[PDB]
Amino acid sequence: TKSELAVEILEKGQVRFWMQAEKLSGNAKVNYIFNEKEIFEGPKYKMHIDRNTGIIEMFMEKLQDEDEGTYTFQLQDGKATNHSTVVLVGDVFKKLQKEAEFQRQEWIRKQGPHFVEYLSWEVTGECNVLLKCKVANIKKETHIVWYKDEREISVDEKHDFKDGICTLLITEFSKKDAGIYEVILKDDRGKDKSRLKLVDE
């Protein structure tokens, strides 16, 4: 065994269980085990063996809570028999699960219109407040919608860009302008949201 069973998070948040054998014959057999029960290729687990490199892999799209536990690859090649086990319990499980969830959601988010910088505010002009954000992967069809307190606020609709700044000018800022501002980006590729609680005293 060149390396024992280990688990890492890949791009798109995929979960990769892998180990490396020094050598495989091409006639090797692997059994995959989770919490003392054999598991099989299908909608949940995908398995791969690369003969030349000795790499044996199992992939998952994400970790459900019930996926906490002990994983074993049982390897048989000729008379040689080995196993390698990883225990995914406690903090390591939580960390893997959260990292997978975060990376998967981030990859998805980025395939559509999304925020690069979330809402912030500045003062400009004659005591005005400008709300601003920075967005990316916008297309002509993308809807950009601004709200205060769940009520739409109309702005000029000129996003003749893919990446850029979106702003909302609040003229003569006063108490009536306090509230929860939101900007939604959306098209058939995805939806992203930003929020800003603007107070006045």
Backbone as JSON, one array per atom type, in Angstrom:
{
  "sequence": "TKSELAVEILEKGQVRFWMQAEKLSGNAKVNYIFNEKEIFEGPKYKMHIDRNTGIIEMFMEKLQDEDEGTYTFQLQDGKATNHSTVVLVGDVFKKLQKEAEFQRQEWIRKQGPHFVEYLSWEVTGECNVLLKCKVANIKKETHIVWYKDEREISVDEKHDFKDGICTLLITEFSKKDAGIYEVILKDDRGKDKSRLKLVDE",
  "N": [[0.82, -1.21, 0.0], [0.72, 2.07, -1.05], [-0.52, 4.52, -0.26], [-2.79, 4.96, 2.46], [-6.4, 4.71, 2.78], [-8.04, 7.74, 2.26], [-9.87, 10.88, 2.52], [-11.14, 13.53, 0.66], [-12.2, 16.82, -0.4], [-13.24, 17.8, -3.59], [-13.16, 19.94, -6.59], [-16.29, 21.48, -7.37], [-17.33, 20.4, -5.18], [-17.38, 17.7, -4.88], [-17.02, 14.56, -3.16], [-14.18, 12.73, -2.48], [-13.04, 9.52, -1.91], [-10.07, 7.83, -1.49], [-7.33, 5.55, -2.17], [-3.98, 4.3, -2.6], [-2.52, 1.58, -4.14], [0.6, -0.1, -4.22], [0.99, -1.85, -6.41], [-1.22, -3.16, -8.92], [-2.81, -5.94, -10.5], [-4.65, -6.05, -12.53], [-6.49, -7.88, -12.31], [-7.46, -7.46, -9.85], [-9.72, -7.24, -7.04], [-12.19, -5.26, -5.51], [-13.96, -4.58, -2.53], [-16.37, -2.43, -1.19], [-17.04, -0.78, 1.81], [-19.27, 0.42, 4.27], [-19.83, 1.41, 7.52], [-19.77, -1.32, 8.31], [-21.26, -2.58, 6.36], [-21.67, -3.72, 3.07], [-21.31, -1.56, 0.28], [-22.47, -0.31, -2.92], [-21.89, 0.56, -6.38], [-23.83, 3.12, -7.93], [-26.53, 5.49, -7.69], [-25.56, 6.91, -5.56], [-22.9, 6.25, -4.86], [-19.87, 6.23, -6.73], [-17.47, 4.26, -8.33], [-13.98, 3.73, -9.03], [-11.15, 2.26, -10.57], [-7.74, 2.55, -11.26], [-5.47, 0.94, -13.11], [-2.67, 1.18, -13.8], [-1.63, 3.25, -12.03], [-2.39, 2.34, -9.57], [-4.37, 3.49, -8.13], [-7.33, 3.61, -6.24], [-10.64, 4.52, -6.06], [-13.54, 6.12, -4.62], [-16.42, 7.99, -5.24], [-18.6, 10.56, -3.97], [-21.51, 12.66, -4.19], [-22.16, 14.34, -2.16], [-22.26, 14.65, 1.48], [-24.53, 13.11, 3.52], [-26.12, 13.43, 6.72], [-26.39, 10.81, 7.75], [-24.25, 9.66, 6.69], [-22.05, 9.73, 8.26], [-19.44, 7.91, 9.72], [-17.62, 4.75, 9.42], [-15.41, 3.84, 6.86], [-14.32, 1.37, 4.58], [-12.01, 0.04, 2.24], [-11.74, -2.99, 0.8], [-9.31, -4.93, -0.45], [-8.39, -7.3, -2.88], [-6.0, -9.12, -4.52], [-4.83, -11.62, -6.29], [-3.23, -13.81, -4.09], [-2.68, -11.99, -2.28], [-4.07, -9.85, 0.13], [-5.6, -7.01, 1.36], [-6.71, -4.3, 3.45], [-8.03, -1.01, 3.86], [-8.84, 1.57, 6.03], [-10.88, 4.33, 6.86], [-11.97, 6.56, 9.35], [-14.71, 8.5, 9.66], [-15.81, 10.49, 11.72], [-17.28, 12.68, 14.12], [-15.6, 15.8, 14.56], [-14.05, 15.72, 12.13], [-15.82, 14.67, 10.33], [-17.94, 16.56, 10.28], [-16.51, 18.74, 9.26], [-15.64, 17.9, 6.7], [-18.21, 17.49, 5.6], [-19.38, 20.07, 5.64], [-17.56, 21.53, 4.13], [-17.77, 20.27, 1.65], [-20.48, 20.9, 1.1], [-20.36, 23.71, 1.0], [-18.47, 24.18, -1.11], [-19.81, 22.95, -3.25], [-22.19, 24.44, -3.48], [-21.07, 26.96, -4.0], [-19.78, 26.54, -6.51], [-22.07, 25.97, -8.1], [-23.49, 28.43, -7.76], [-21.78, 30.19, -9.11], [-22.06, 29.42, -11.75], [-24.22, 30.71, -12.68], [-25.69, 34.07, -12.75], [-24.1, 36.13, -10.38], [-22.96, 37.46, -7.17], [-19.91, 39.19, -6.66], [-18.92, 41.14, -5.05], [-20.75, 41.81, -2.19], [-23.63, 43.75, -1.04], [-22.85, 47.05, -0.11], [-22.55, 50.32, 1.46], [-22.17, 53.82, 0.67], [-21.52, 57.36, 1.14], [-22.42, 60.1, -0.89], [-22.42, 63.0, -3.05], [-24.9, 65.49, -2.28], [-25.41, 64.76, 0.65], [-26.36, 62.21, -0.03], [-27.0, 58.65, -0.17], [-25.34, 55.95, -1.54], [-26.0, 52.73, -2.59], [-24.18, 49.83, -3.24], [-22.84, 47.14, -5.24], [-21.03, 44.34, -6.61], [-21.16, 42.42, -9.5], [-21.17, 39.35, -11.43], [-20.93, 37.29, -14.41], [-23.27, 37.99, -15.78], [-26.0, 38.09, -18.07], [-27.74, 39.28, -21.06], [-30.41, 38.57, -20.67], [-30.63, 38.41, -17.91], [-32.34, 39.08, -14.88], [-32.25, 41.83, -12.74], [-33.08, 42.82, -9.63], [-34.17, 45.15, -7.32], [-34.94, 45.66, -3.86], [-36.62, 47.18, -1.04], [-37.45, 46.28, 2.15], [-38.98, 44.1, 1.25], [-40.39, 45.18, -0.84], [-40.46, 46.06, -4.22], [-38.08, 48.23, -5.85], [-37.75, 50.29, -8.54], [-35.12, 50.58, -10.93], [-32.89, 52.03, -13.42], [-32.55, 49.97, -16.25], [-29.98, 49.02, -17.45], [-27.84, 46.89, -17.94], [-25.66, 46.27, -19.78], [-23.52, 44.48, -19.7], [-21.27, 41.82, -18.58], [-19.76, 41.46, -16.27], [-19.76, 43.68, -13.54], [-20.53, 46.82, -11.77], [-23.4, 47.41, -9.76], [-25.76, 49.75, -8.72], [-27.67, 51.77, -6.38], [-29.09, 54.78, -5.93], [-29.85, 56.65, -3.12], [-31.59, 59.44, -2.54], [-31.03, 62.34, -0.65], [-30.77, 61.17, 2.01], [-32.58, 59.92, 4.78], [-34.48, 59.18, 7.81], [-36.63, 57.75, 6.77], [-35.6, 56.2, 4.91], [-34.38, 54.11, 6.0], [-34.07, 50.57, 6.38], [-34.39, 47.1, 5.21], [-32.52, 46.35, 2.57], [-32.37, 44.65, -0.57], [-30.89, 42.81, -3.25], [-31.62, 40.96, -6.07], [-30.36, 38.59, -8.33], [-31.12, 36.97, -11.31], [-31.66, 34.32, -13.67], [-32.36, 31.73, -16.1], [-30.17, 30.22, -15.45], [-29.48, 30.41, -12.8], [-29.83, 31.82, -9.43], [-29.06, 34.56, -7.33], [-28.55, 36.3, -4.24], [-28.33, 39.36, -2.37], [-28.11, 41.19, 0.68], [-28.77, 44.03, 2.78], [-28.88, 45.59, 5.79], [-29.95, 48.64, 6.46], [-29.55, 51.19, 8.68], [-30.7, 54.05, 10.62], [-29.69, 55.57, 13.16]],
  "CA": [[0.0, 0.0, 0.0], [1.44, 3.34, -1.13], [-1.19, 5.39, 0.71], [-4.01, 4.43, 3.04], [-7.64, 5.37, 2.46], [-8.2, 9.12, 2.7], [-11.05, 11.51, 1.94], [-10.94, 14.94, 0.43], [-13.23, 17.49, -1.18], [-12.72, 18.28, -4.87], [-13.94, 20.95, -7.27], [-17.72, 21.22, -7.43], [-17.69, 19.88, -3.87], [-17.43, 16.24, -4.89], [-16.28, 13.9, -2.09], [-13.34, 11.66, -3.04], [-12.35, 8.57, -1.04], [-9.07, 7.21, -2.37], [-6.09, 5.02, -1.64], [-3.12, 3.88, -3.69], [-1.77, 0.35, -3.96], [1.88, -0.14, -4.93], [0.76, -2.49, -7.7], [-2.43, -3.92, -9.2], [-2.58, -6.88, -11.59], [-5.69, -5.96, -13.54], [-7.45, -8.86, -11.84], [-7.77, -7.13, -8.47], [-11.13, -7.1, -6.7], [-12.39, -4.38, -4.37], [-15.25, -4.46, -1.87], [-16.49, -1.14, -0.52], [-17.79, -1.04, 3.03], [-19.6, 1.56, 5.11], [-20.42, 0.95, 8.79], [-19.85, -2.77, 8.33], [-22.19, -3.06, 5.35], [-21.14, -3.49, 1.73], [-21.99, -0.58, -0.57], [-22.37, -0.63, -4.34], [-22.03, 1.61, -7.39], [-25.2, 3.52, -8.2], [-26.83, 6.92, -7.64], [-24.93, 7.48, -4.37], [-21.46, 5.99, -4.91], [-19.25, 5.88, -8.01], [-16.19, 3.64, -8.02], [-13.04, 3.69, -10.14], [-9.82, 1.72, -10.32], [-6.78, 2.79, -12.33], [-4.53, -0.16, -13.02], [-1.28, 1.62, -13.8], [-1.25, 4.06, -10.87], [-2.8, 1.65, -8.35], [-5.35, 4.33, -7.43], [-8.68, 3.07, -6.1], [-11.4, 5.71, -5.69], [-15.0, 6.12, -4.58], [-16.87, 9.37, -5.21], [-19.97, 10.9, -3.56], [-21.9, 14.01, -4.55], [-22.3, 15.1, -0.92], [-22.37, 13.8, 2.67], [-25.72, 13.24, 4.34], [-25.84, 13.17, 8.12], [-26.29, 9.36, 7.98], [-23.0, 9.22, 6.08], [-21.01, 9.71, 9.27], [-19.07, 6.55, 10.09], [-16.35, 4.13, 9.08], [-15.35, 3.37, 5.49], [-13.21, 0.46, 4.32], [-11.81, -0.58, 0.94], [-11.17, -4.33, 0.96], [-8.64, -5.21, -1.71], [-7.89, -8.65, -3.1], [-5.29, -9.3, -5.78], [-4.15, -12.89, -6.14], [-3.3, -14.29, -2.71], [-2.54, -10.78, -1.48], [-5.32, -9.28, 0.6], [-5.37, -5.88, 2.24], [-7.83, -3.39, 3.62], [-7.64, 0.26, 4.41], [-10.03, 2.08, 6.69], [-10.9, 5.7, 7.35], [-13.07, 6.8, 10.27], [-15.2, 9.86, 9.48], [-16.71, 10.69, 12.85], [-16.99, 13.85, 14.93], [-15.17, 17.01, 13.89], [-13.59, 15.53, 10.75], [-17.0, 14.47, 9.49], [-18.59, 17.86, 10.14], [-15.67, 19.59, 8.44], [-15.8, 17.39, 5.34], [-19.57, 17.71, 5.12], [-19.6, 21.5, 5.44], [-16.69, 21.95, 3.03], [-18.44, 19.76, 0.45], [-21.68, 21.69, 0.87], [-19.97, 25.05, 0.62], [-17.87, 24.18, -2.45], [-20.81, 22.6, -4.26], [-23.06, 25.6, -3.64], [-20.29, 28.01, -4.65], [-19.65, 26.22, -7.92], [-23.38, 26.19, -8.7], [-23.75, 29.87, -7.73], [-20.94, 30.84, -10.11], [-22.5, 29.04, -13.1], [-25.21, 31.7, -13.07], [-25.36, 35.44, -12.34], [-23.78, 36.08, -8.96], [-22.22, 38.53, -6.54], [-18.48, 39.16, -6.37], [-18.97, 41.91, -3.82], [-22.11, 41.99, -1.69], [-24.08, 45.12, -0.87], [-22.3, 47.96, 0.9], [-23.08, 51.66, 1.25], [-21.31, 54.99, 0.78], [-22.16, 58.67, 1.06], [-21.96, 60.83, -2.07], [-23.22, 64.16, -3.39], [-25.44, 66.3, -1.2], [-25.96, 63.89, 1.68], [-27.01, 61.04, -0.58], [-26.4, 57.36, 0.11], [-25.29, 55.05, -2.69], [-25.83, 51.32, -2.3], [-23.39, 49.28, -4.33], [-22.4, 45.76, -5.21], [-20.33, 43.97, -7.82], [-21.75, 41.18, -9.97], [-20.44, 38.69, -12.5], [-21.63, 36.3, -15.22], [-24.57, 38.52, -16.15], [-26.31, 38.08, -19.5], [-28.79, 40.22, -21.43], [-31.67, 38.08, -20.1], [-30.6, 38.42, -16.45], [-33.13, 40.05, -14.14], [-31.66, 42.42, -11.54], [-34.24, 43.39, -8.96], [-33.86, 45.76, -6.04], [-36.05, 45.75, -2.9], [-36.5, 47.61, 0.35], [-38.52, 45.73, 2.97], [-39.76, 43.19, 0.42], [-41.11, 45.91, -1.88], [-39.55, 46.4, -5.32], [-37.69, 49.58, -6.2], [-37.33, 50.28, -9.94], [-33.92, 51.32, -11.33], [-32.57, 51.93, -14.84], [-32.2, 48.6, -16.58], [-28.93, 49.0, -18.45], [-26.7, 46.04, -17.61], [-25.02, 45.85, -21.02], [-22.24, 43.92, -19.3], [-21.23, 40.51, -17.96], [-19.25, 41.72, -14.93], [-19.75, 45.11, -13.26], [-21.1, 47.36, -10.54], [-24.8, 47.8, -9.76], [-25.92, 50.73, -7.66], [-28.97, 52.38, -6.15], [-28.89, 56.05, -5.25], [-30.87, 57.16, -2.21], [-31.39, 60.88, -2.56], [-31.37, 63.03, 0.59], [-30.95, 60.1, 2.98], [-33.19, 60.26, 6.05], [-34.97, 58.02, 8.54], [-37.61, 56.99, 5.99], [-34.82, 55.39, 3.98], [-33.9, 52.97, 6.76], [-34.75, 49.33, 6.06], [-33.63, 45.97, 4.69], [-32.39, 46.39, 1.12], [-31.96, 43.39, -1.18], [-30.79, 42.76, -4.71], [-31.7, 39.6, -6.58], [-29.92, 38.37, -9.7], [-31.72, 35.71, -11.71], [-32.08, 33.89, -15.0], [-32.53, 30.28, -16.08], [-28.93, 29.56, -15.02], [-29.38, 30.44, -11.35], [-30.31, 32.99, -8.7], [-28.2, 34.93, -6.21], [-29.17, 37.39, -3.47], [-27.53, 40.09, -1.4], [-28.97, 41.92, 1.59], [-28.11, 45.05, 3.57], [-29.71, 46.26, 6.77], [-29.53, 50.03, 6.55], [-30.22, 51.85, 9.79], [-30.47, 55.46, 10.87], [-29.78, 55.73, 14.61]],
  "C": [[0.86, 1.26, 0.0], [0.81, 4.42, -0.25], [-2.5, 4.78, 1.19], [-5.2, 5.26, 2.59], [-7.72, 6.76, 3.09], [-9.37, 9.77, 1.97], [-10.81, 12.98, 1.82], [-12.1, 15.5, -0.38], [-12.62, 18.07, -2.45], [-13.49, 19.51, -5.37], [-15.39, 20.51, -7.38], [-18.23, 20.58, -6.15], [-17.84, 18.36, -3.84], [-16.59, 15.69, -3.73], [-15.49, 12.73, -2.67], [-12.69, 10.81, -1.95], [-11.32, 7.9, -1.92], [-7.93, 6.58, -1.58], [-5.25, 4.62, -2.84], [-2.38, 2.61, -3.31], [-0.47, 0.48, -4.74], [1.7, -0.73, -6.33], [-0.57, -3.24, -7.76], [-2.22, -4.75, -10.46], [-3.48, -6.64, -12.79], [-6.77, -6.99, -13.26], [-7.85, -8.62, -10.38], [-9.27, -6.98, -8.26], [-11.24, -6.2, -5.48], [-13.82, -4.48, -3.85], [-15.26, -3.16, -1.1], [-17.45, -1.28, 0.64], [-18.04, 0.25, 3.79], [-20.35, 1.07, 6.34], [-20.75, -0.54, 8.77], [-20.86, -3.36, 7.34], [-21.63, -2.75, 3.97], [-21.98, -2.47, 0.98], [-21.6, -0.77, -2.03], [-22.58, 0.57, -5.24], [-23.49, 1.85, -7.8], [-25.34, 5.02, -8.1], [-26.07, 7.65, -6.54], [-23.4, 7.4, -4.43], [-21.0, 5.66, -6.32], [-17.85, 5.39, -7.73], [-15.28, 3.59, -9.25], [-11.73, 3.09, -9.71], [-8.93, 2.01, -11.52], [-5.63, 1.82, -12.13], [-3.12, 0.37, -12.85], [-0.82, 2.32, -12.53], [-1.55, 3.37, -9.53], [-3.85, 2.42, -7.55], [-6.75, 3.72, -7.43], [-9.5, 4.2, -5.47], [-12.89, 5.41, -5.54], [-15.44, 7.57, -4.44], [-18.31, 9.48, -4.7], [-20.25, 12.36, -3.9], [-21.94, 14.92, -3.34], [-22.37, 14.13, 0.25], [-23.66, 14.11, 3.42], [-25.3, 13.0, 5.77], [-25.6, 11.68, 8.38], [-24.99, 8.81, 7.4], [-21.81, 9.29, 7.02], [-20.71, 8.26, 9.67], [-17.74, 6.06, 9.55], [-16.4, 3.52, 7.69], [-14.13, 2.48, 5.29], [-13.19, 0.03, 2.85], [-11.11, -1.9, 1.2], [-10.62, -4.74, -0.38], [-8.14, -6.64, -1.76], [-7.27, -8.76, -4.48], [-4.43, -10.54, -5.64], [-4.33, -13.43, -4.73], [-3.14, -13.12, -1.75], [-3.9, -10.18, -1.14], [-5.01, -8.17, 1.59], [-6.64, -5.07, 2.39], [-7.26, -2.07, 4.05], [-8.92, 0.92, 4.88], [-9.84, 3.53, 7.07], [-12.15, 5.9, 8.22], [-13.49, 8.26, 10.15], [-16.26, 10.16, 10.52], [-16.3, 11.96, 13.58], [-16.61, 15.07, 14.1], [-14.73, 16.82, 12.43], [-14.77, 15.33, 9.84], [-17.69, 15.79, 9.22], [-17.84, 18.77, 9.17], [-15.77, 19.2, 6.97], [-17.17, 17.74, 4.8], [-19.82, 19.17, 4.77], [-18.78, 22.03, 4.26], [-17.26, 21.5, 1.68], [-19.66, 20.62, 0.1], [-21.33, 23.08, 0.36], [-19.41, 25.06, -0.81], [-18.86, 23.83, -3.54], [-21.72, 23.79, -4.53], [-22.35, 26.77, -4.31], [-20.11, 27.77, -6.14], [-20.97, 26.46, -8.66], [-23.7, 27.69, -8.85], [-23.04, 30.58, -8.89], [-21.29, 30.49, -11.55], [-23.63, 29.94, -13.59], [-24.75, 33.11, -12.71], [-25.15, 35.47, -10.84], [-23.0, 37.3, -8.48], [-20.74, 38.21, -6.33], [-18.21, 40.02, -5.15], [-20.43, 42.14, -3.44], [-22.38, 43.45, -1.35], [-23.27, 45.83, 0.2], [-22.86, 49.34, 0.61], [-21.96, 52.69, 1.33], [-22.14, 56.26, 0.74], [-21.57, 59.41, -0.13], [-22.89, 62.02, -2.3], [-23.69, 64.95, -2.19], [-26.17, 65.46, -0.18], [-26.82, 62.77, 1.09], [-26.31, 59.78, -0.08], [-26.47, 56.53, -1.15], [-25.11, 53.63, -2.18], [-25.13, 50.72, -3.49], [-23.05, 47.83, -4.12], [-21.68, 45.49, -6.52], [-20.79, 42.57, -8.24], [-20.97, 40.63, -11.15], [-21.33, 37.66, -13.2], [-23.07, 36.7, -15.51], [-24.76, 38.33, -17.64], [-27.48, 39.01, -19.78], [-30.12, 39.87, -20.75], [-31.76, 38.19, -18.57], [-31.52, 39.48, -15.85], [-32.36, 40.51, -12.9], [-32.75, 43.22, -10.85], [-33.83, 43.9, -7.6], [-35.11, 45.83, -5.17], [-35.64, 46.54, -1.66], [-37.71, 47.07, 1.11], [-39.52, 44.9, 2.16], [-40.6, 43.88, -0.65], [-40.13, 46.35, -2.96], [-39.31, 47.91, -5.46], [-37.16, 49.52, -7.63], [-36.06, 51.12, -10.17], [-33.74, 51.19, -12.84], [-32.07, 50.53, -15.15], [-31.19, 48.55, -17.72], [-27.72, 48.22, -17.95], [-26.1, 45.41, -18.87], [-23.63, 45.32, -20.72], [-22.4, 42.51, -18.74], [-20.77, 40.62, -16.51], [-19.24, 43.24, -14.68], [-20.4, 45.52, -11.96], [-22.57, 47.69, -10.76], [-25.01, 48.68, -8.55], [-27.36, 51.19, -7.53], [-28.72, 53.65, -5.36], [-30.09, 56.44, -4.41], [-30.65, 58.65, -2.04], [-31.85, 61.47, -1.23], [-31.72, 62.05, 1.71], [-31.53, 60.6, 4.3], [-33.8, 59.02, 6.68], [-35.9, 57.14, 7.7], [-36.91, 56.03, 5.05], [-34.21, 54.18, 4.68], [-34.72, 51.73, 6.4], [-33.81, 48.23, 5.59], [-33.66, 46.03, 3.17], [-31.89, 45.04, 0.61], [-31.8, 43.56, -2.67], [-30.76, 41.3, -5.11], [-31.16, 39.61, -8.01], [-30.51, 37.03, -10.13], [-31.93, 35.53, -13.2], [-32.18, 32.38, -14.96], [-31.29, 29.52, -15.6], [-28.75, 29.55, -13.5], [-29.9, 31.73, -10.75], [-29.34, 33.29, -7.57], [-28.83, 36.13, -5.52], [-28.13, 38.07, -2.61], [-28.48, 40.93, -0.56], [-28.15, 42.92, 2.41], [-29.11, 45.72, 4.48], [-29.19, 47.67, 6.94], [-30.28, 50.71, 7.68], [-29.93, 53.34, 9.81], [-30.73, 55.74, 12.35], [-30.46, 54.52, 15.26]]
}
